[PDB]
Amino acid sequence: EEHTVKAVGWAARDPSGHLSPFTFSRRATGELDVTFKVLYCGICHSDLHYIKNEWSNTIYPALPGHEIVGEVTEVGSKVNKFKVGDKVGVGCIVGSCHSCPNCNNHLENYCPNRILTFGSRYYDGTLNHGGYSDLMVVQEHFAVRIPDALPLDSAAPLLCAGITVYSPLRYYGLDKPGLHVGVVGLGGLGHMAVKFAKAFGVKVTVVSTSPAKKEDAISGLGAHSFILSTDAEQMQAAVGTMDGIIDTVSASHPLPPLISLLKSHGKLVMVGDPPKPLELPVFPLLLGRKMVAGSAIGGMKETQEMIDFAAKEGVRADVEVIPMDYVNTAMQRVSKSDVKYRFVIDIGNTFNDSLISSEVEHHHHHH
């Protein structure tokens, strides 16, 4: 009888990026799906880029949001891992092929046929709409369980910003007590990198061009050290001291000074995306057996592991919780990195309020 259900979200209609209400269909709960009421959605810079057509390949209407937390309302007839009332999360992926080496190794994020939460179509040919919405539907394999111990309002950023830095900290071996890791960029990603590295027992140094970020790094986040990258004496004092660097900056910046901070066998891991190629001198990689490497989000198994780790170790994103109807103002602030350090929309308490008509009640006397 019922093949789709009605959902409501805030969506952009053109490259202005202006968000407004949008009513659309989602699939009804299939045998292996989970339907949930959205309670919080983090705001990612990718959300802004997509609604602004930054890559010239946005499909409008464009409904972003891929840091999605909520409460299960319906489970498919074959679903066993979730029950009604469970708190769940959805990140950047909602599908993959389940029969390639990456999928088979818990790396759906590197599946060549991965399906992103938005900027893509589902197997049904329907456009994928994200988490700035009241209701979400996801195949069970692509939902994670959120523990009771974890506050839901600050959990949401783990699903993209958190996993983006957790995954390479683990894969590149930058998670053992006593190591020294540098973090470049102190925005949403960078602040999660400091938090997870601290929780692993790693000594964390924030590297920044801005003297104002010293207070943020040291007093705000509890980083072990700060280097002002424009001060040559500070950069020189730190030559060859870092086991690795998580570089979160998606803007031009010089690479050689960062390679110099690395110890031999050190790893510069990029998780940001600068728009132009960067200039890589090979000799210093040879002389010190150094590397420059990349990573993107994380697979499902590790996403669940990370959530469990955060719950147990006390890791919490620093969030600014906002009503849905503030989202366009938030987007202007995100474009200036004017948040410490992530916006989270309180969908559960504010979304419907944003839809309620503000037409003043009146008799119509003038004819």
Which residue ranges make up the site for a copy of itself (CB under 8 A)?
A: 102, 107, 110, 171, 264-265, 270-274, 277-296
| Shortest Å, Cβ 144 to a copy of itself | 21
- What the block records as the tokens of 145 is 């369980």
Look at residues 81, 65, 31 and name the one whose alpha carbon lies nearest to residue 134: 65
Q: Amino acid letter at 24?
A: F
- For residue 294, how many C-alpha atoms fall within 13 Å in the half-sphere facing its CB? 7
Contact 179, 243 (CB under 8 A): yes
Among 29, 35, 46, 167, binds Zn ion (CB under 5 A): 46
Closer to Zn ion by CB, 241 or 349: give it: 241
- Give yes or no for residue 250 binding Zn ion (CB under 5 A): no
291 binds, among a copy of itself, Zn ion, none (CB under 5 to 8 A by kind): a copy of itself
Q: In which region does residue 79 sit, left (phi positive, over 0), alpha (psi from -120 to 50) or beta (all else)?
A: beta
303 binds, among Zn ion, a copy of itself, none (CB under 5 to 8 A by kind): none
| Shortest Å, Cβ 362 to Zn ion | 45
280 binds, among a copy of itself, Zn ion, none (CB under 5 to 8 A by kind): a copy of itself
The count of residues in the chain is 367
| Shortest Å, Cβ 103 to a copy of itself | 11
Q: Is 44 annotated as a binding residue?
A: yes
Identify the burial level of 108 via C-beta atoms within 10 angstroms of its C-beta, where 0-12 means exposed, 13-18 middle and 19 or more buried.
buried
| Shortest Å, Cβ 124 to Zn ion | 19
Q: Is 41 annotated as a binding residue?
A: no
Closer to a copy of itself by CB, 135 or 270: give it: 270
- Rounded distance, CA 75 to CA 59, Å? 29
| Shortest Å, Cβ 92 to a copy of itself | 12
Closer to a copy of itself by CB, 102 or 234: give it: 102
Q: Tell me how far CA of residue 74 lies from CA of 46, 78, 109, 124, in angstroms.
A: 29, 12, 26, 20
| Shortest Å, Cβ 56 to a copy of itself | 15
The residue assigned the tokens 């997870």 is: 196
Q: Is 97 annotated as a binding residue?
A: yes
- Give yes or no for residue 44 binding Zn ion (CB under 5 A): yes
- What the block records as the tokens of 199 is 């929780």
Region of 35-43, 89-97, 205-213, 215-223 interacting with Zn ion (CB under 5 A): 89-97
The residues that bridge with 68 in the sheet, in sequence order, are 41, 90
| Shortest Å, Cβ 310 to Zn ion | 17
Closer to Zn ion by CB, 93 or 150: give it: 93
Closer to Zn ion by CB, 34 or 116: give it: 116
Q: In which region does residue 328 sit, left (phi positive, over 0), alpha (psi from -120 to 50) or beta (all else)?
A: alpha
- Rounded distance, CA 87 to CA 103, Å? 25
Look at residues 169, 212, 182 and name the one whose alpha carbon lies nearest to residue 302: 169
281 binds, among a copy of itself, Zn ion, none (CB under 5 to 8 A by kind): a copy of itself
Binding to Zn ion (CB under 5 A) within 106-145 occurs at 111
Binding to Zn ion (CB under 5 A) within 156-215 occurs at 160
79 binds, among Zn ion, a copy of itself, none (CB under 5 to 8 A by kind): none
Contact 142, 172 (CB under 8 A): no
| Alpha-carbon torsion (255, 261, 265, 266), positive or negative | negative
Contact 315, 196 (CB under 8 A): yes
- Give yes or no for residue 96 binding Zn ion (CB under 5 A): yes
Binding to Zn ion (CB under 5 A) within 329-348 occurs at none
Look at residues 115, 130, 106, 122 and name the one whose alpha carbon lies nearest to residue 50: 130
Closer to a copy of itself by CB, 55 or 123: give it: 55
Binding site residues for Zn(2+), as ranges? 44, 97, 100, 103, 111, 160
Which amino acids are annotated as binding site, given as ranges? 44, 97, 100, 103, 111, 160
Judged by the rule CB under 5 A, the positions of this chain that interact with Zn ion are: 44, 46, 96-97, 100, 103, 111, 160
